[PDB]
Amino acid sequence: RKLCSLDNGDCDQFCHEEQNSVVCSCARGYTLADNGKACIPTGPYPCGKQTL
Amino acid sequence: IVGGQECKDGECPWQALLINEENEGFCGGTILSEFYILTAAHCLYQAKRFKVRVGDRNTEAVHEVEVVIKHNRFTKETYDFDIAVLRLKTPITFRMNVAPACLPERDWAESTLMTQKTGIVSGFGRTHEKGRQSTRLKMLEVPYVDRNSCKLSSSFIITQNMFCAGYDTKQEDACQGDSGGPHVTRFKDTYFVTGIVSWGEGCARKGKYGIYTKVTAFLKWIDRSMKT
Numbered sequence: 001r002k003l004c005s006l007d008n009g010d011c012d013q014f015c016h017e018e019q020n021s022v023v024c025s026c027a028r029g030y031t032l033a034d035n036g037k038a039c040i041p042t043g044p045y046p047c048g049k050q051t052l
Numbered sequence: 053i054v055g056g057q058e059c060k061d062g063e064c065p066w067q068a069l070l071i072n073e074e075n076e077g078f079c080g081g082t083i084l085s086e087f088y089i090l091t092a093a094h095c096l097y098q099a100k101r102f103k104v105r106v107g108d109r110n111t112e113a114v115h116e117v118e119v120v121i122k123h124n125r126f127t128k129e130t131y132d133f134d135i136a137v138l139r140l141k142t143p144i145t146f147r148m149n150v151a152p153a154c155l156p157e158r159d160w161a162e163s164t165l166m167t168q169k170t171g172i173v174s175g176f177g178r179t180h181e182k183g184r185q186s187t188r189l190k191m192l193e194v195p196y197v198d199r200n201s202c203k204l205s206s207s208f209i210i211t212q213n214m215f216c217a218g219y220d221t222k223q224e225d226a227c228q229g230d231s232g233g234p235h236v237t238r239f240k241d242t243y244f245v246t247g248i249v250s251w252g253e254g255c256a257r258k259g260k261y262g263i264y265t266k267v268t269a270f271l272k273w274i275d276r277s278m279k280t
């Protein structure tokens with residue numbers, strides 16, 4: 001297990017492998033954090049989150 | 053939903069309910085955005101006119117539909133391509149119990165979501181094969197089923213646009229009235245749409261599974277439908 005196969009490449013959401021390295025990305029309504037791995041909601045009620 | 057548990061406050065906020073003229077729910081749907089609902093093509097034959105209800109966990113806001121986009125390849129015979137997108141007349145206001153599920157990117161969904169052990173199905177359908185619709189929204193964790201086991205268990209052809217989920221012996225399944233509703237998969241506390249409740253040979257029948265429309269097979273179709 002390497003890259004996206006290893007714990008999803010440390011990405012919160014989408015993981016892709018480009019040129020032998022991990023590239024993370026996020027669903028609409030999220031912005032990729034500065035660390036290039038976390039996904040930050042842009043608003044209230046981002047997709048896929050329970051409203052708890 | 054046969055078996056499973058009641059959806060508690062805020063747990064299934066992407067659930068939508070299609071209701072006929074007589075305000076009775078007959079199918080589910082999944083909220084995709086403020087204007088768009090995902091549902092099953094076959095649901096579109098169960099009522100002449102219908103509206104979409106969101107937010108109510110206990111049947112005891114309503115949105116009219118502007119455009120119905122039905123997959124042109126749907127066939128009543130095989131239930132292949134059992135998918136439709138609805139554009140509402142007015143946008144949904146997100147709030148407690150009302151929020152969209154995420155659409156995943158296709159390859160990632162196939163390698164990361166469809167390979168998880170389970171997904172979650174929800175709806176206001178019957179709680180027993182013979183029964184009245186549930187007044188409470190229910191949810192049920194359902195294991196993904198191996199494609200070969202799936203085809204072996206089935207009296208009908210399972211196409212590549214479909215997948216199986218559920219239990220072989222344990223008596224828990226989606227049921228009548230749940231069709232068109234969400235199958236979602238959790239990944240790091242985010243829920244992605246992965247299926248549409250489509251069909252089953254009865255509810256929770258021994259040696260049978262629930263059959264779902266594979267959303268990954270239609271991601272581009274969905275994206276295009278939400279632009280026009």
Ligand SMILES: C[C@H](c1ccc(N2CC[C@H](NS(=O)(=O)/C=C/c3ccc(Cl)s3)C2=O)c(F)c1)N(C)C
Pocket residue numbers: 128129130131208225226227228229231249250251252253254255256261262263264
């Ligand atoms: C493959 C397709 C087909 C097979 C079986 C069915 N049936 C027969 C009964 C069943 N109706 S139902 O109880 O409202 C649906 C139950 C479900 C159980 C699990 C699901 Cl996922 S959906 C159902 O969907 C069907 F509607 C369609 N063809 C034969 C029309």
